[PDB]
Design a protein around this nucleic acid. Sequence first.
RNA 1: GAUGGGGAAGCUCCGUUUCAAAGGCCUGAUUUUAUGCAGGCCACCAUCGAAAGGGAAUCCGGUUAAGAUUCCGGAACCUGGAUAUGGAUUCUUCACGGUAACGUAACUGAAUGUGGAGACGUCGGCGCGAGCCCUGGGAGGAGUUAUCUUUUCUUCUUAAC
RNA 2: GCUUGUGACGGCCCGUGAAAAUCCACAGGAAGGAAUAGUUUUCAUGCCAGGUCGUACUGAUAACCGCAGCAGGUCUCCAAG
RNA 3: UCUAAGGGUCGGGUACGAUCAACUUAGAACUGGUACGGACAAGGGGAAUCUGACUGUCUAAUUAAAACAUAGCAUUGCGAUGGUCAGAAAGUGAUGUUGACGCAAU
Lengths: 252, 112, 77, 91, 135
Amino acid sequence: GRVIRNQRKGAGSIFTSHTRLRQGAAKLRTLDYAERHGYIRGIVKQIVHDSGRGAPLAKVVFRDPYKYRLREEIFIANEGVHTGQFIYAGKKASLNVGNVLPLGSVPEGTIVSNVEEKPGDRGALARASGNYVIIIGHNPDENKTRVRLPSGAKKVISSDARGVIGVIAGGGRVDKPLLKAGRAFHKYRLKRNSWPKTRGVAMNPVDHPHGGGNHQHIGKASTISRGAVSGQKAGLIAARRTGLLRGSQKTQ
Amino acid sequence: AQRVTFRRRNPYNTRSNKIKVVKTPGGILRAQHVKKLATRPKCGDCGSALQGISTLRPRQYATVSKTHKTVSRAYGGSRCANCVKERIIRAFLIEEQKIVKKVVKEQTEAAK
Amino acid sequence: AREITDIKQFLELTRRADVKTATVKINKKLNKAGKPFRQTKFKVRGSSSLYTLVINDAGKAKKLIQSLPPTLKVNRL
Amino acid sequence: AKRTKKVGITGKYGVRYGSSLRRQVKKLEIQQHARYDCSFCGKKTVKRGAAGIWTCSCCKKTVAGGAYTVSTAAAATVRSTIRRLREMVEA
Amino acid sequence: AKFLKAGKVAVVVRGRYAGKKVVIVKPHDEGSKSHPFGHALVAGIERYPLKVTKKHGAKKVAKRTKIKPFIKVVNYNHLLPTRYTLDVEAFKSVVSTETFEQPSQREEAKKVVKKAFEERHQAGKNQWFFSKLRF
RNA sequence: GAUGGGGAAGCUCCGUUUCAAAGGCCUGAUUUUAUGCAGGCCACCAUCGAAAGGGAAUCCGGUUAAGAUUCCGGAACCUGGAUAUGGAUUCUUCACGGUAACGUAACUGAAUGUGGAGACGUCGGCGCGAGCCCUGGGAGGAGUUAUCUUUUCUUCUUAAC
RNA sequence: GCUUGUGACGGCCCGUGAAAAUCCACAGGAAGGAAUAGUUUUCAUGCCAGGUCGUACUGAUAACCGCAGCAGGUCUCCAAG
RNA sequence: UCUAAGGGUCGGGUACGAUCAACUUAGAACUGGUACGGACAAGGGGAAUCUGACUGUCUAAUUAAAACAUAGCAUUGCGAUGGUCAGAAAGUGAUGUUGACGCAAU
Ligand SMILES: [Mg+2]
Ligand SMILES: [Mg+2]
Ligand SMILES: [Mg+2]
Ligand SMILES: [Mg+2]
Ligand SMILES: [Mg+2]
Ligand SMILES: [Mg+2]
Ligand SMILES: [Mg+2]
Ligand SMILES: [Mg+2]
Ligand SMILES: [Mg+2]
Ligand SMILES: [Mg+2]
Ligand SMILES: [Mg+2]
Ligand SMILES: [Mg+2]
Ligand SMILES: [Mg+2]
Ligand SMILES: [Mg+2]
Ligand SMILES: [Mg+2]
Ligand SMILES: [Mg+2]
Ligand SMILES: [Mg+2]
Ligand SMILES: [Mg+2]
Ligand SMILES: [Mg+2]
Ligand SMILES: [Mg+2]
Ligand SMILES: [Mg+2]
Ligand SMILES: [Mg+2]
Ligand SMILES: [Mg+2]
Ligand SMILES: [Mg+2]
Ligand SMILES: [Mg+2]
Ligand SMILES: [Mg+2]
Ligand SMILES: [Mg+2]
Ligand SMILES: [Mg+2]
Ligand SMILES: [Mg+2]
Ligand SMILES: [Mg+2]
Ligand SMILES: [Mg+2]
Ligand SMILES: [Mg+2]
Ligand SMILES: [Mg+2]
Ligand SMILES: [Mg+2]
Ligand SMILES: [Mg+2]
Ligand SMILES: [Mg+2]
Ligand SMILES: [Mg+2]
Ligand SMILES: [Mg+2]
Ligand SMILES: [Mg+2]
Ligand SMILES: [Mg+2]
Ligand SMILES: [Mg+2]
Ligand SMILES: [Mg+2]
Ligand SMILES: [Mg+2]
Ligand SMILES: [Mg+2]
Ligand SMILES: [Mg+2]
Ligand SMILES: [Mg+2]
Ligand SMILES: [Mg+2]
Ligand SMILES: [Mg+2]
Ligand SMILES: [Zn+2]
């Protein structure tokens, strides 16, 4: 039969990200000479909504060390940072909400955000609204630092990898019921074309592994193997358990 | 009762196709096309429409004398006076307080 | 387009290098509430715009017309 | 004259969606539309303007905050944590 | 003390001359029939001597170091009083009430004050005063 | 959607500022002379894509069998290029005035920097403008009139600049 | 009153509602410039030039699409008592 | 055919007067072949069972529904040297101007 929906997604025709209104990509400062020997100061000049994103952006501007001009950056605003605030960035920066520092220079327990996966990658970890990473240890020989990501995962990255002190703004966005179809409508209208969702169990066999039959039903385990092939992977991929989760979760 | 027609080929009601009805000396109603309204220039520091300064559409400013584009203070047509009080005050004290910090840590480097 | 009201400035106009042609119009008009009177507009046509001077006094009117440059090609009415 | 025994702002949804959802919405609505205190100048004039953004009418500071409330519990504890942790570093 | 007195330097903080540095030459601590407010009478400098360097030859130095002065009646609430202070003897009489009112008397006044300021400037007295406040 | 490139037997596919030695301006240097080098910049690296988006500047009256914001009449405005005369400015060289918001007929300003404008959703009531609608007086033309109606209809307009 | 324009406000969002050409301003102060006479075209007035293609008419119960002068279809402005 | 209530503008030393202009609402008489939202315009109502919560969606041209969607609930995969997906290949591509309050899959 036909190419199913989740395969058509990849050719990104009607499926590319709706991008027109976006502020620009959020990114730490390029890791230059200032930030890795000293600190450099900026002013947050505006904190601002970014369509499709949930957390507001901070627009923060710095002087240029090598040329007379301003260079502006787009940060993701940590909660509590504000317009006119001075933002300090560098190895020898001080430990306050809003500043950006290398995880090597912060005590364990430090609560950071937008952290780099490798030094210089201008930020990758915990950027969504409300999210953060905790520093839970250091290993000064072979300078690594060990952190706990929002997913629960613990991971060890370079101590020069940078992050910004505090948590990302907009927390609890998801506490509030969407209430109606229409609010989801406008939600995804500014993201990508993933809404609404026909159940494969409502299609015909041409369309889906789940399609067809004189009652609606999956007709075979919907836990599909990792090694399955395109066209096959619909449902609980690689599922190592299944069913209502009883009892406390949380990584021991 | 006298009705009216657009005067350019564009039939649609777009921002660039605003119309105003007018009585001619012939004693008839006629459409006139109307340019979009100019907005007031704004202050670099605060953002308020800055007083003193004429408001035209941007190219219409190169048709008009220099005094429609300034007030006669420092940062004239650019920042909004109160915003420049602030600038002067803040400059001064900080340049002053800089003298202060130097001589204080000069004493730290001589008594310790 | 323009209007002029300094009698002195007007004679200065009427002799400018481009001012070739000019005209005098006469209007019957009423005075205050009661009677009417004789208004006369002096229009010099300079190159880029038309200056017009309204002398409201029939007296000043006559004498002004005599002062009119004897090469100016005045259109009377 | 009390206009509603309990739906409050939530009366605009009529009978739809189910009382429970309307409850949850009610709580965060009241939060987000509320007027808050401004730390910098002291007038209670901080109103929200899109999730996470909190601006002051007078005086004009804008502070990144919670999706529906100026300060988030998590934010707040984190703040003092940082207070605490930094304290060690000069001491 | 009543610190707005005989030679207090101050920064003009509104008006045309805003940000320029002046000297109070005669204070009117309270009132005038006109000017109904605390005001001082100042000798400001409108066009600062431009920095000068070694590359700067004979007359280029001459040009660079000419000062355009100004005299102003100005409200107290428009000055930032300065710790620095500059001597005001050579043009005490020059700047006065009667100095203002009638332009010609003003132009005379500035002539003197101008001479006084360029004397002062060379052999760098009051070094601060002859240096643009930058903002 | 070209180009340095990378795939592909190949028709061609990919990429669009990319793993590239990617170019042109301002004036100064010429008084063999016409444009070679002397500065310092600027590294922005195609191009196509809207007759509803952005956008320099025009209006009225008249005129044709059939065109007209396009012709005719009259009155404007913009853009480029030329430039002289007046005015303004200066012996305190680059204007004065006003406490101030700021005023003005003018009132030198390269590199570089920065700010504004262009430039922005939707609904609700409220305030004001325009044109239209309703209406008194008056000056006119029409209609009705056995009877009745100081009556019924209509003209009394003003463009950009 | 009606239509339209516009302002000062107010509601709303896990929706906060283009871009570029282009025009001006400011900060800066390289430079250039007068007294036996200089500076000034962001003030006024003055001079010259503005190419190329479209422009008729229909726009619908007959000028478009439905084999047609087809009861179908096809985007829009003006709007009297 | 009457009555009643609801307004504007003015001068007043440091209680009122005078004037101009609006349908709104309520009450009272009178009157007619008991008619009067007089044409036009304009909701049938009630008690229950089945079924989908709702608004929304589709078989252009025999099915508009109880089907699809939805908010809500729950499960799965993934920390980027990745999950899911594209491509004949590639210094190729979607999600991605993204980062678990996220993207993908039921
Ligand atoms: Mg894209
Ligand atoms: Mg869809
Ligand atoms: Mg579904
Ligand atoms: Mg589903
Ligand atoms: Mg089916
Ligand atoms: Mg199948
Ligand atoms: Mg199967
Ligand atoms: Mg099936
Ligand atoms: Mg089933
Ligand atoms: Mg037309
Ligand atoms: Mg609209
Ligand atoms: Mg003005
Ligand atoms: Mg001005
Ligand atoms: Mg200056
Ligand atoms: Mg190509
Ligand atoms: Mg083009
Ligand atoms: Mg166009
Ligand atoms: Mg257009
Ligand atoms: Mg005509
Ligand atoms: Mg003809
Ligand atoms: Mg015609
Ligand atoms: Mg003509
Ligand atoms: Mg002409
Ligand atoms: Mg010109
Ligand atoms: Mg002047
Ligand atoms: Mg700009
Ligand atoms: Mg802008
Ligand atoms: Mg637009
Ligand atoms: Mg016009
Ligand atoms: Mg309409
Ligand atoms: Mg808004
Ligand atoms: Mg401007
Ligand atoms: Mg040089
Ligand atoms: Mg000019
Ligand atoms: Mg035509
Ligand atoms: Mg026809
Ligand atoms: Mg037909
Ligand atoms: Mg009454
Ligand atoms: Mg009355
Ligand atoms: Mg039954
Ligand atoms: Mg239903
Ligand atoms: Mg329905
Ligand atoms: Mg059907
Ligand atoms: Mg069929
Ligand atoms: Mg139906
Ligand atoms: Mg049917
Ligand atoms: Mg349920
Ligand atoms: Mg390869
Ligand atoms: Zn405040």
